[PDB]
Amino acid sequence: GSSGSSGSQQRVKRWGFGMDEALKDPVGREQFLKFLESEFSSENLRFWLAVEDLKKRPIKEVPSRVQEIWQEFLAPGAPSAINLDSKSYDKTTHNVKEPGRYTFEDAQEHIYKLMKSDSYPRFIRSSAYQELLSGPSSG
């Protein structure tokens, strides 16, 4: 919804519970991400989201993206080039062959199970997250 209501500090806290919540809210998604980019970890998340949306994309932009997403993080010469286990990575590489909607479903799990307690955790440790709670502004 375009419109909202008063009460951001309370909302933020939600994200301090687990990536899950952070994702639900729009601001929490970008906020939590920001910190990632800094630690050059965003790649993990960036890829995740790409998947959730991937399916959303039309059949015309379904396949075209498949390879793309895999060429962004699931690629060797890529910027967000992520890293996955052997058993997992192997399965993915094979799935890629045929572009679909849940082709990268497997990976989504591995990463998700990671970022959840991989990056999210730090977010709480750092202050960037606290900022919102208090109020990131002059005063």
Curated annotation (Swiss-Prot):
- Where does it reside? Cytoplasm, Cytosol; Cytoplasm; Cell membrane; Membrane
PTM comment: the record says: Palmitoylated.
Source domain of life is Eukaryota
RGS domain: which residues? 18-133
Q: Tell me the residues on which Phosphoserine occurs.
A: S119
Subunit composition and interactions: Interacts with GNB5, forming the RGS7-GNB5 complex. Interacts with GPR158; promotes the GTPase activator activity of the RGS7-GNB5 complex in absence of glycine, in contrast GTPase activator activity of the RGS7-GNB5 complex is inhibited in presence of glycine. Interacts with GPR179. Interacts with PKD1; this prevents rapid proteasomal degradation. Interacts with RGS7BP, leading to regulate the subcellular location of the heterodimer formed with GNB5. Interacts (phosphorylated form) with 14-3-3 protein YWHAQ. Interacts with SNAPIN. Interacts with GNAI1. Interacts with GNAO1, GNAI3 and GNAZ.
Q: Name the job this protein performs.
A: GTPase activator component of the RGS7-GNB5 complex that regulates G protein-coupled receptor signaling cascades. The RGS7-GNB5 complex acts as an inhibitor signal transduction by promoting the GTPase activity of G protein alpha subunits, such as GNAO1, thereby driving them into their inactive GDP-bound form. May play a role in synaptic vesicle exocytosis. Glycine-dependent regulation of the RGS7-GNB5 complex by GPR158 affects mood and cognition via its ability to regulate neuronal excitability in L2/L3 pyramidal neurons of the prefrontal cortex.
Name the record gives this protein: Regulator of G-protein signaling 7
Biological source species = Homo sapiens (Human)
Which gene is annotated as encoding this protein in its UniProt record? RGS7
Covered residues of the complete protein? 323 to 448 of 495
